[PDB]
Amino acid sequence: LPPGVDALVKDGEEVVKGQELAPGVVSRLDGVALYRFPRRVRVEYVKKERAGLRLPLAAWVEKEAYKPGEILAELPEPYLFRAEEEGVVELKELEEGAFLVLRREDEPVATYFLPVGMTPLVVHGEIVEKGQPLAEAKGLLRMPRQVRAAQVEAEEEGETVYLTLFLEWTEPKDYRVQPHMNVVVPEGARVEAGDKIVAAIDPEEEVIAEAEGVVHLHEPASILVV
Amino acid sequence: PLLTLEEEVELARKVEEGMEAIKKLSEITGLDPDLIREVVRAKILGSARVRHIPGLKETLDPKTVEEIDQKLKSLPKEHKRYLHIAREGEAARQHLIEANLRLVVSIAKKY
DNA sequence: GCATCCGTGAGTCCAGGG
DNA sequence: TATAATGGGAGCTGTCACGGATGC
């Protein structure tokens, strides 16, 4: 496999004779493909948190849970989602959507979830007072593809709803594998805190798993069809 | 074909660890590390090449290699792990020699 | 089957040898 | 015993009949 270009196929699966294995590799034979030397290991660490969002009551599509991509509300006009706490902003922009966390001193004080359609109006590290706009939702706002809403609690108050969402998603972290290192973990396996992913000559170069997650292997040095 | 750095290191690692596994299997089973190495080799190579060894105290006969392979296969999973380690090591050893046969030729053409 | 294309072993006696 | 080293060289010339082996 040329440097950097990734596989069009994954480790463990059967392939057909002539079925291309990569943008410049075609398999002369049928059988099980296998990864030789993964040069990038991406770990999807699983995060399950509780977050909140306030919405106009009319614009809300009441449901008990939300699958990804699913419409969460529809706004007839621009709407400013405002802070209900004072603090310093920690903005974590996922693939789609975001999480605001306001923190006072060294303790977190609010965790807001901005689904797709909400443009955050604050920058990481910013100071915010109660009521100031954190983000603007235009309309047809919906869940991101990468995150799902397990459970949904609602509170009516005035002309709005406050959703307490039990969200579950994954955040990826990559690691560059060196030729003198061997991946000791299979594709799609479940690591815990402290479980070793990639071994290396000297221990300070090892790859140990921070939290729980799954393992995904990318850019093999070569691919072995057997 | 010629080893890449990665294939080189992988096979060498497998060899080192298989030798360590033979040592651990000797600690567990109380057998002779040489006897164990010969039985693992006998199974990796095949009965095509199954002869006696001058250092071994017991004639290496298919009967005895089967007996020792069965004494090994009856070990608990965490012990029988080392048998798979050793078999992998021997296969790597064969492959590493075979891959470096050309270097011998390039040296010997000068003598 | 019918030619052609091959391998192979053979070539008097004596002497001396540098 | 540890930098790294990865596929070789040599030819060779004025015979002849014959049994067996390959192409037609």
> Domain map of chain B by residue range?
1-111
Please, what CATH class does the domain formed by B1-111 belong to? Answer: mainly alpha
Residues of chain B (5-44) having a beta carbon less than 7 angstroms from strand D? 8
How near does any CA of chain A get to the CA of B9, in Å?
A: 7
Q: Which residues are CB-neighbours of B74 under 8 A, at least 6 positions away?
A: none
User: CB B13 to CB A36 under 8 A?
Assistant: no
At A182, is the secondary structure helix, strand, or coil?
Answer: strand
Q: How far is CA A102 from CA A122, A144, B10, B66, in A?
A: 11, 21, 48, 68
Tokens for A219, please give them: 């850019």
Amino acid at position A139, single letter: G
Structure resolution, Å: 2.5
User: CB A180 to CB B10 under 8 A?
Assistant: no
**Greatest CA separation found in chain B?**
53
Q: How far is CA A108 from CA A132, A191, A221, in A?
A: 18, 27, 44
Kindly report the bases of strand D lying within 7 A of a protein C-beta atom: 5-9
**Please, which experimental method was used?**
X-ray
Length of chain B: 111
- Distance, CA of B106 to C1' of D8, in Å: 9
How many angstroms separate the CA atoms of A74 and A117, rounded?
10
Backbone angles phi, psi at A114, to 5 degrees: -105, 100
Q: Which residues are CB-neighbours of B33 under 8 A, at least 6 positions away?
A: B22, B23, B25, B26
Residue with tokens 């099980």: A32
Count the helix, strand and coil residues of chain A and give each as a percent rounded to the nearest 5. 0, 55, 45
Q: Are strands A190-191 and A213-220 parallel, antiparallel or unpaired?
A: antiparallel
- CB contacts < 8 Å between A and B, how many? 12
Q: Which residues are CB-neighbours of A106 under 8 A, at least 6 positions away?
A: none
Is there a contact between A31 and A15 (Cβ–Cβ < 8 Å)?
yes
Q: Where are the domains of chain A?
A: 1-225
How many angstroms separate the CA atoms of A54 and A162, rounded?
4
How many angstroms separate the CA atoms of A35 and A226, rounded?
11
Q: Which residues are CB-neighbours of B43 under 8 A, at least 6 positions away?
A: B65, B69, B87
Asked if strand D comes closer than 7 Å to B4 Cβ, the answer is no
Cα B65 to its chain centre, rounded Å, is 14
Through-space distance between the first and last CA atoms of chain A, rounded to whole angstroms: 16
Q: Report angle CA B100, B105, B108 to the nearest 5 degrees.
A: 130
- Helix (DSSP H) and strand (DSSP E) numbers for chain B: 5, 0
